[PDB]
Design a protein around this ligand. Structure first.
Ligand SMILES: [Mg+2]
Ligand SMILES: [Mg+2]
Lengths: 244, 222, 240, 204, 4, 195, 231, 212, 230, 235
């Protein structure tokens, strides 16, 4: 029968590893780097677009940074198509919670459920896992500003600063060096861009190969604002820190 | 609107002795004011020295007997030809009846036989499976006529010892098979006189350790 | 539905998928359980290749199943969440029907049954997780500590460890734990637990987690400084 | 036991010169018993306003449902939903429950941010769109509201004048209905400012 | 059916 | 079932619930507690159809307790009331709806404010300074409209509540065998034993 | 070789190896014999034990008052198939008030076994059956193979060393077919038939299993001291 | 039916009548309305005869499975809740049951739960259930004290059923008595109302409404 | 739940010494309208059984198809289909009785009253009744509808009990059946003059008589009857 | 790979044969049947000294008149026991009687072959089912994952089975008392066990008509162990 052609996507190796999860992580390590940095007064999300062409429409484009709700966003590393499946599920989940409790969903609850979906694909169903790693950046009134990451295994962890995708080893060492706890958003913006600039596989970091976003309480009094940076705004912030 | 139930009349009667038990029933079958059959038996030997009758709506009665007979067959297959005791049969019949709690078998069921100590046994059921062991039970159309007579003549109810000032009751004792059959025949002739759905013929099944015996008697055919 | 029998017997009579799930447990961070005269202590290793972590929000290694029972584990972190969720649901379901919280044995028996089911169900792989389940039965002061594993077998332990280098810490506990006289106090029990982890861990900084469970739903997690005091005290007695 | 008249309540909407108004009473009762005098029946999703009369549990449920749907709309579309589009969404959602409907009388009001055109619309319980140049009415005093609006209304009223007309329409209609009243709220809506006014009315 |  | 009342004052929410359980022409019990603690600072009283009431109350209790264990956190009274409303809103279009009316009294620890929610079996939620279900409201609402002030103390709230029970004991047809009174504040839930 | 992974695969010479491997399980089974006259049909079965402490595996199963079989191979598969026969015999009685013809019983078993040889996932039955019965056309003996093939015979035998009894019955055909109105003699012939398949072991009292059905005899099984008469 | 059970100083008394009726027809005078679930648990029957008998023997099987699985006798609370949750699933389907689950365990002590077919479950000290419940209440309430002796408590339970048997047309037959202690239930005999009424009348001097 | 539309009236039958007789008229009524006149309500199964059906005709035609299919199915893999393994009257009845009771139990009955008449392989007479309720019974005489009220009393004068069957010839039995059919034509408002009759004998086999008419009727006395009293 | 329900060329099911190898790795369990009762004994075999041995549950009650011992992948036995208990209680509900020991065993064995591509694999555990009923008296059954069960006068399963079985062949006779059987299980367990036999690493149980199924205390077994050592030294 069809047994012959089954890859058996949800089995253990003799060493106790999940083949498909490991190979999905290998795929993600070639994707454009994405960095998240959590400051005391906000969060920065910075991501490098995958080798751009000059005829690519840059302003009406979205590849790395997605909005889940007004208080939560994600940076993507891996297959974009896979990520959009998960993003729409996460968007719906947030609205289900709001409908049920009349309160915006706590960040961890959203992260746990999305991670549980990934876990399911590694234990049952015989399907390939999602080749995606997320950086979650969000705010709620319990823990305030939070950074999380999830990967194809469905395992998630919290961070002060973290990178996913390519050159995470080099990126993490650089973040670990210059990061400190009393840091501000504007300093974190600079750290994020400096780290990408040194870890990039490109010749020089330019505005057209970046996506950028902040989550501040920099609105008016006790409320959170999501700022997905426009091309010209990335051009300006790149000049302001003296990278170009 | 379609009515899935009917009333086929007739009446049945079970009495237990010391080492025997009888299950009697008239052979008349009716609908409304018509006679369908003057001889249509409704007391059956179900094997393992168990006799059974399910009186009321004959279609439901036949279905139940059919299912119980089948239950006895599978009891042998599944438990190494073990004899189904009368108490085990009774419990099994409860589940048959209660299984249709929300669309009931429209029958009053009586079974008779010997218990595991060799003593006579009669069990009676309501339509949805409530059951009880008794020395005595009449069922069906003329149950209300016969049952009080049985209370008086089998269980000696309302009978006191003469000259004892109504202080000492008439003592309970087992009846011989000859005495029991006298009561059965008189019960059915009386019921035939005063109930229109009862008559034609009487068939008695007697159960001892030797097996199941039958006796037939004519009843008035009007 | 995906039906494939993934867990099957081999010629020598082994179920390799279950045995490979045990290897995943062996890779996981070390977890230890020690029960005293009036308490149970759950100790857990946290690897230090991860700096820049946010410990406020990062999932804790020891999880409350109910107010009186806790669960720690070694192995795949994502797999453990599924077991913990099911256990928490069963805990509330038990309170609803029996009008009494679960015993530690019952909760363990349930979790172990779930694990077993995933070893002979089609289309699923076993859980790459072994658990330590500790607590106190309702209206009871006798400490309880149980262990489960991917195969589905479970058992009670005076003290036990699971995860990487668990054979080293088990060796330590086997000579340092007296059955005739268990750690009489909370301090003694925590110290023996911290000592056992210090055989394997590295630094006693933000690498060790300790959770103490006492009778009548009295569970608390120790902070860094509180644990660091045990680390400081043990090292000074060692130099002798 | 008529679902649309257990709790009581009314909503009315009107158009003016480069503006729209939507108003509602505050009563929530259980037949004769007045229970709450704070039960607002007008909600908004961005710049689009929705008033709902009828069974209060369905009023609450539908508000939560349309907040849900407009939030997902905005995330995917990257823009606020417009009144014309939202009107269609309400109609689709109500007709989905054709043979087990929400017992409601919704009313959409707002200004299209692109064209600047004032827009109002009404629905029956199962989705039928009722578009109007002038006014839409709903609730247990709909007969009264129809009478007040038809006589008092004139086209191209200034925002300040439109406020007086819609307020007098609602107040005098509510006072002829046992199940409506107990306070009132009026929304005056211009292209980029919205004023909300609570009216003084008789409390019987 | 009988009641009790 | 029958009588459940609620009063929100300055610093607490007070719930009063009748003790009688009547079936036919017999009062089967005169000490019934028609309430369940959903969380340390949230209490729910209930009245309605026999069986449904307790079954619904305990089902909600189990769900909130499950949430508390999962997140190691207490849901706000507003969040719990919305969850309860949705369950009743689902129920009303089921094959057999829960015929249960509830009051939810809670103290929000983040806002430091008492909160009282009235929810009927249809899923009709309102936040109120004082609430009642069934025929009780026909006496108590007008009484409270007159005597209630928003800045009252817990003691003043209890005296205000005594006034309601006295009126009900005078004018109500049925003997409801008094009430069990419980207070919800910053320190949690406690029962008044002598009422 | 490469074509024996499942029942859904034909070999290049048109063989079904999984069905053939199922057939092999019957050959390993203990010998059982079947034979009939015009009035009676008899089953004789050699029972097998695990060791001297164990019981002897029962080989004969009753299906109805007028029908039953003996088994050789996987006993649980015989239980499944016999249960199916019990139901089919029973359906015929309840619905049509009709005793199931032994020939129809054979057709029903054939079709049930066949379905397991043409679909993915399943496996063939691993047991052979000898069905005896007495119906409206007299005494009958059937041989069931899990390939699906069912065959009506005067006499036969299946299991290990069944060729000895099968040869004997082939010689004795003219004699035992005319043993009419004499149960004990027809059994004697069957007991002598199964004796041709014995090696190093002989027929003892808790080793031999005999069953008989006929004109005025319901299907009944004899074990223990009731077969001492025939040793 | 008339059934009662009350808690007191010396444990629990349980008393029931034995009559079954189909309308005005007296179907039986010898029905067993107490079911012995285990040596420490009793169940009483009122309402539908089949409904009560079927589901309470089913309850006994569920209690047996509990002690096999948990190696411990089931609590009265848990046993009663199995029955109440069962009937709640059938709510609206037309089951008719008024039952009392009575027993002793170490953690609970003597405990009585009222369970009926519309899903009501109540812990309590005194309950009377059935068509004659009010007649039983009248006698039981007006003579009840917590400090009754085992001898007096047994008599009061017996006397309360007799009162209902006499006045309620749909109660009668005989009285079945039970006493539940820390050591389990104890049967205190079948008492025919035929003899018991006259014996009580003569010895007690009550029932003066009746022609002596 | 149904209501019968096109209907057939009485089916009557009795046992005699060597076999059974059964009869039914050829009418398909549509309420009070005597709509169809060429309707055959006796359906033979093999050469040993006749099934007589009254009630709803659409359901009768369905039952015809079932019996037709039963003959086909019985012949499958059956070398003795025309001998020892031919369909017996008892098999045919039990099958129909099973169907009738199953349909009533699903609250969607076949709105019919059925009489299965035939001779068994051992020569025994078979005669049994079944209806929409699944009720079954046997008697020396059987009849449906008005036949139960008017035919049975007449047929029971010939065969009143079991012992009267050997004493009753086919000539006497047929005479009683034909007389009963005349009485039904006098008194049943949904009867016709035309009918079919079938005899199943253990010696001569199945004889199926079509297009019979009620004759030798008494009407002459009607001329003397004038007014309604005075 | 290959089908789960595949036959070998020798006419055996691969998976069933492989599960039998898993059972050989299991701890020893012994059962002996007498006219005074049936005795069931098992080797506990704790993997570590810190493990509390009394939590090792390899002897189990099915009903009052039926007990059970296991060997192999013991986690697999839980659903088998659950089914056995339900089957026993359900039969009592339907028939107001005790279920026959053989009928119980047959019900458990019906689960065995319900695997394939139903559960994904056979059970990796063998069961010794011991009980009493009125018809056939005291009985001992060996239930395998093949779906086959044999009645035994005495039987050993597990790692030391073939050595213990040969010993049971010599020692068993039809007149053994219950006490004689108890000592015989202890004797044979002590012979095949790795570690030295005591009350903590071995467990005894029995089923009698009068008292039903009982697991012995560690105090009661300890005295039988002491009685056994004294009797072997006494000649
Ligand atoms: Mg008004
Ligand atoms: Mg007013």
């Amino acid at each position: 029968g069809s047994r012959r052609y089954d890859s058996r996507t949800t089995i253990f190796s003799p060493e106790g590893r999940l083949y498909q999860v490991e190979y999905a992580l290998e795929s993600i390590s070639h994707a454009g780097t994405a960095i998240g940095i959590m400051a005391s007064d906000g969060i920065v999300l910075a991501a490098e677009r995958k080798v751009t062409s000059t005829l690519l429409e840059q302003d009406t484009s979205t590849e790395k940074l997605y909005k889940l709700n007004d208080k939560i966003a994600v940076a993507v590393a891996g297959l974009t198509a896979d990520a959009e499946i998960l993003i729409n599920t996460a968007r719906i989940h947030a609205q289900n919670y709001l409908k049920t409790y009349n309160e915006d969903i706590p960040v961890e609850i959203l992260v746990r459920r999305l991670s549980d979906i990934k876990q399911g694909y590694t234990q049952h169903g015989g399907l390939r896992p999602f080749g995606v790693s997320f950086i979650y950046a969000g705010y709620d009134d319990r823990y305030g500003y939070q950074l999380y990451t999830s990967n194809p295994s469905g395992n998630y962890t919290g961070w002060k600063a973290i990178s996913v995708g390519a050159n995470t080893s080099a990126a993490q060492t650089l973040l670990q060096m210059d990061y400190k706890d009393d840091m501000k958003v504007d300093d974190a913006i600079e750290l994020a861009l400096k780290t990408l600039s040194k870890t990039t596989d490109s010749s020089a970091l330019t505005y057209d190969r970046l996506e950028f976003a902040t989550i501040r309480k920099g609105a008016n009094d006790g409320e959170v604002y999501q700022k997905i940076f426009k091309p010209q705004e990335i051009k300006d912030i790149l000049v302001k820190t003296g990278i170009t | 609107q379609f009515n899935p139930y009917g009333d086929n009349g007739g009446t049945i009667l079970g009495i237990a002795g010391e080492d025997f038990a009888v299950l009697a029933g008239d052979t008349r079958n009716i609908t409304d004011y018509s006679i369908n059959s003057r001889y249509e038996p409704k007391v059956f030997d179900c094997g393992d020295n168990i006799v059974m009758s399910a009186n009321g709506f004959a279609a439901d009665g036949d279905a139940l007997v059919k299912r119980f007979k089948n239950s006895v067959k599978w009891y042998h297959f599944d438990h190494n030809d073990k004899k189904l005791s009368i108490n085990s049969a009774a419990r099994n019949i409860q589940h048959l009846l209660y299984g249709k709690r929300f669309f009931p078998y429209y029958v009053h069921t009586i079974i008779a036989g010997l218990d595991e100590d060799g003593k006579g046994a009669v069990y009676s059921f309501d339509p949805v499976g409530s059951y009880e062991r008794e020395q005595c039970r009449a069922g069906g159309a003329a149950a209300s006529l016969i049952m009080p007579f049985l209370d008086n003549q089998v269980n000696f109810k309302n009978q006191y010892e003469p000259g004892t000032n109504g202080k000492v009751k008439k003592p309970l004792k087992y009846l011989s098979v000859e005495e029991v059959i006298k009561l059965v025949r008189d019960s059915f002739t009386s019921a035939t006189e005063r109930h229109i759905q009862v008559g034609d013929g009487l068939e008695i099944l007697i159960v001892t350790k030797d097996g199941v015996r039958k006796e037939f008697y004519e009843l008035k055919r009007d | 539905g995906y039906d494939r029998a993934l867990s099957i017997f081999s010629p020598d009579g082994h179920i390799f998928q279950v045995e490979y799930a045990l290897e995943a447990v062996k890779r996981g961070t070390c977890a230890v359980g020690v029960k005293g005269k009036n308490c149970v202590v759950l100790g857990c290793e946290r690897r230090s290749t991860l700096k820049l972590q946010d410990t406020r929000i990062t999932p804790s290694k020891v999880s409350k199943i109910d107010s009186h029972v806790v669960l720690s584990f070694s192995g795949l972190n994502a797999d453990s969440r599924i077991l913990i969720e099911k256990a928490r649901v069963e805990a509330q379901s038990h309170r609803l029907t029996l009008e009494d919280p679960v015993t530690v044995e019952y909760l363990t028996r349930y979790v172990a049954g779930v694990q077993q089911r995933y070893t002979q169900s089609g289309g699923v792989r076993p859980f790459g997780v072994s658990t330590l389940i500790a607590g106190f039965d309702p209206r009871d002061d006798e400490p309880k500590l149980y262990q489960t594993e991917p195969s589905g077998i479970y058992s009670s332990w005076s003290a036990q460890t699971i995860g990487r280098n668990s054979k080293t810490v088990r060796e330590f506990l086997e000579k340092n734990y007296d059955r005739k006289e268990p750690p009489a106090t909370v301090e003694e029990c925590v110290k023996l637990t911290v000592r056992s982890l210090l055989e394997v861990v590295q630094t006693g900084a933000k690498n060790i987690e300790i959770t103490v469970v006492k009778p009548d739903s009295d569970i608390v997690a120790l902070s860094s400084e509180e644990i660091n005091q045990y680390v400081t005290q043990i090292e000074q007695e060692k130099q002798e | 036991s008529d679902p649309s008249s257990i709790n009581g309540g009314i909503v009315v909407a009107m158009t003016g010169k480069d503006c729209v108004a939507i108003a509602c009473d505050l009563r929530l009762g259980s037949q004769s018993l007045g229970v709450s005098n704070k039960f607002e029946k007008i909600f908004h999703y961005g710049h689009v306003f929705l008033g709902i009369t009828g069974l209060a549990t369905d009023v609450t449920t539908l508000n939560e449902m349309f907040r849900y749907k407009t939030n997902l709309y905005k995330l995917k579309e990257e823009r606020a939903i417009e009144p014309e589009t939202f009107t269609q969404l309400v109609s689709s959602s109500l007709y989905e429950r054709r043979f087990g409907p929400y017992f409601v009388g919704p009313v959409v009001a707002g200004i299209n941010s692109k064209s600047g055109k004032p827009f109002i619309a009404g629905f029956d319980l199962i989705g039928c769109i009722d578009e109007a140049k002038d006014f839409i009415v709903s609730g247990t005093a709909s007969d009264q509201l129809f009478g007040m609006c038809e006589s008092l209304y004139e086209p191209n009223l200034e925002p300040e004048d439109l406020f007086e007309t819609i307020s007098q329409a609602l107040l005098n209609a509510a006072d002829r209905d046992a199940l409506s009243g107990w306070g009132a709220v009026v929304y005056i809506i211009k292209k980029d400012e919205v004023v909300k006014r609570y009216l003084k009315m008789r409390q019987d | 059916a009988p009641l009790x | 079932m029958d009588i459940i009342l609620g009063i929100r004052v300055q610093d607490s929410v007070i719930l009063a619930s009748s003790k009688a359980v009547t079936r036919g022409i017999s009062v089967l019990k005169d000490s019934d507690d028609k309430t369940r603690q959903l969380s340390p600072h949230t209490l729910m009283s209930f009245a309605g159809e026999a069986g449904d009431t307790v079954q619904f109350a305990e089902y909600i209790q189990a769900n909130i307790q499950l949430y508390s264990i999962r997140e190691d956190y207490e849901l706000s009274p507003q969040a719990v009331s919305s969850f309860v409303r949705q369950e009743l809103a689902k129920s009303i279009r089921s094959r057999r709806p829960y015929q249960v009316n509830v009051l939810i009294g809670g103290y929000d620890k983040k806002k430091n404010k008492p909160e009282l929610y009235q929810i009927d079996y249809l899923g009709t939620k309102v936040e109120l300074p004082y609430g009642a279900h069934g025929y009780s409201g026909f006496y108590t609402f007008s009484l409270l409209d007159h005597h209630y002030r928003p800045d009252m103390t817990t003691e003043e709230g209890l005296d205000l509540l005594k006034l309601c029970v006295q009126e009900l004991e005078k004018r109500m047809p049925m003997d409801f065998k008094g009430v069990i009174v419980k207070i919800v504040d910053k320190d949690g839930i406690r029962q008044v034993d002598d009422f | 070789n490469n074509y024996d992974g499942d029942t859904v695969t034909f070999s290049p010479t048109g063989r079904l190896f999984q069905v053939e491997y199922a057939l092999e399980a019957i050959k390993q089974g203990s010998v059982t014999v079947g034979l009939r006259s015009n009035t009676h049909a008899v089953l004789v079965a050699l029972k097998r034990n695990a060791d001297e402490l164990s019981s002897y595996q029962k080989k004969i199963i009753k299906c109805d008052e007028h029908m039953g079989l003996s088994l050789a191979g996987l006993a649980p598969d015989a239980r499944v198939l016999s249960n199916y026969l019990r139901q089919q015999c029973n359906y015929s009685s309840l619905v049509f008030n009709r005793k199931l013809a032994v020939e129809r019983a054979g057709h029903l078993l054939c079709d049930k076994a066949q379905k397991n040889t043409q679909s993915y996932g399943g496996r063939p039955y691993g047991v052979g059956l000898l069905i005896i019965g007495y119906d409206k056309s007299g005494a009958h003996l059937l041989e069931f193979q899990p390939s699906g093939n069912v065959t009506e015979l005067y006499g036969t035998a299946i299991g290990a060393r069944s060729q000895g009894a099968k040869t004997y019955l082939e010689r004795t055909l003219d004699t035992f077919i005319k043993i009419d109105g004499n149960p004990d003699e027809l059994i004697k012939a069957g007991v002598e038939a199964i004796s041709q398949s014995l090696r190093d072991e002989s027929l003892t009292v808790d080793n031999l299993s005999i069953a008989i059905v006929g004109k005025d005899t319901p299907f009944t099984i004899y074990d223990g001291e009731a077969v001492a008469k025939y040793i | 039916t008339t059934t009662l059970a009350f808690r007191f100083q010396g444990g629990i008394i349980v008393a029931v009548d034995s009559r079954a009726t189909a309308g005005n027809w007296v179907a039986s005078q010898t029905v067993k309305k107490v079911i012995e679930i285990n040596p420490f648990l009793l169940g009483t029957m009122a309402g539908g005869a089949a409904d009560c008998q079927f589901w309470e023997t089913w309850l006994g099987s569920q209690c047996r499975l509990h002690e096999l699985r948990e190696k411990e006798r089931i609590s009265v609370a848990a046993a009663s809740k199995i029955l109440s949750n069962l009937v709640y699933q059938y709510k609206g389907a037309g089951l008719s049951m008024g039952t009392m689950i009575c027993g002793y365990t170490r953690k609970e002590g003597p405990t009585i739960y009222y369970v009926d077919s519309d899903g009501t479950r109540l812990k309590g000290d005194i309950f009377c259930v059935g068509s004659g419940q009010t007649f039983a209440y009248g006698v039981l309430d007006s003579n009840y004290k917590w400090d009754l002796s085992v001898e007096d408590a047994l008599y009061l339970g017996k006397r309360s059923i007799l009162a209902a048997a006499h006045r309620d047309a749909y109660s009668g037959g005989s009285v079945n008595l039970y006493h539940v202690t820390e050591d389990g239930w104890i049967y205190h005999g079948n008492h025919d109302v035929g003899e018991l009424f006259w014996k009580v009348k003569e010895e007690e001097g009550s029932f003066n409404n009746v022609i002596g | 739940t149904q209501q019968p539309i096109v209907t057939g009236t009485s089916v009557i039958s009795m046992k005699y010494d060597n076999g059974v007789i059964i009869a039914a008229d050829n009418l398909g009524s549509y309420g009070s309208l005597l709509r169809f006149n060429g309707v055959e309500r006796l359906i033979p199964v093999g050469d040993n059984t006749v099934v007589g059906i009254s009630g709803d005709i659409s359901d009768m035609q369905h039952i015809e198809r079932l019996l037709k299919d039963l003959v086909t199915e019985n012949a499958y893999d059956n070398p003795l289909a025309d001998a020892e393994e031919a369909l017996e009257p008892s098999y045919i009845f039990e099958y129909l009785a099973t169907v009738m009771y199953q349909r009533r139990s699903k609250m969607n009955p076949l709105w019919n009253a059925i009489i299965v008449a035939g001779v068994q392989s051992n020569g025994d007479q078979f005669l049994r009744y079944v209806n929409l309720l699944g009720v079954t019974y046997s008697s020396p005489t059987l009849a449906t509808g008005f036949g139960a009220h008017m035919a049975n009393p007449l047929l029971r004068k010939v065969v009143d009990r079991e012992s009267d069957i050997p004493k009753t010839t086919v000539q006497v039995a047929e005479e009683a059946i034909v007389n009963a059919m005349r009485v039904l034509y006098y008194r049943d408002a949904r009867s016709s003059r035309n009918f079919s009759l079938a005899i199943i004998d253990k010696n001569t086999g199945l004889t199926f008589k079509k297009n019979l008419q009620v004759e030798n009727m008494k009407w002459d006395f009607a001329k003397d009857i004038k007014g309604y009293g005075t | 790979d290959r089908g789960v329900s595949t036959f070998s060329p020798e006419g055996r099911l691969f998976q069933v044969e492989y599960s039998l190898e898993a059972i050989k790795l299991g701890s020893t369990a012994i059962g002996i049947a007498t006219k005074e009762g049936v005795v069931l004994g098992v080797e506990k075999r704790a993997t570590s000294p810190l493990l509390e041995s009394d939590s090792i549950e390899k002897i189990v009650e099915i009903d009052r008149h039926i007990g059970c011992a296991m060997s192999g992948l013991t986690a697999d036995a839980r659903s088998m026991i659950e089914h056995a208990r339900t089957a026993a209680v359900t039969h009592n509900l339907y028939y107001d009687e005790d279920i026959n020991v053989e009928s119980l065993t047959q019900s458990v064995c019906d689960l065995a072959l319900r695997f394939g591509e139903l559960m994904s694999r056979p059970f990796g555990v063998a069961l010794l089912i011991a009980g009493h009923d009125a018809d056939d008296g005291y009985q001992l059954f060996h239930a395998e994952p093949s779906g086959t069960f044999y009645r035994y006068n005495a039987k050993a399963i597990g790692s030391g089975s073939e050595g213990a079985q040969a010993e049971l062949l010599n020692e068993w006779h039809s007149s053994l008392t219950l006490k004689e059987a108890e000592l015989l299980v202890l004797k044979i367990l002590k012979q095949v066990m790795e570690e030295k036999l005591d009350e903590n690493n071995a467990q005894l149980s029995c089923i009698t008509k009068q008292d039903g199924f009982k697991i012995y205390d560690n105090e009661k077994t300890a005295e039988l162990i002491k009685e056994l050592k004294e009797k072997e030294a006494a000649e």
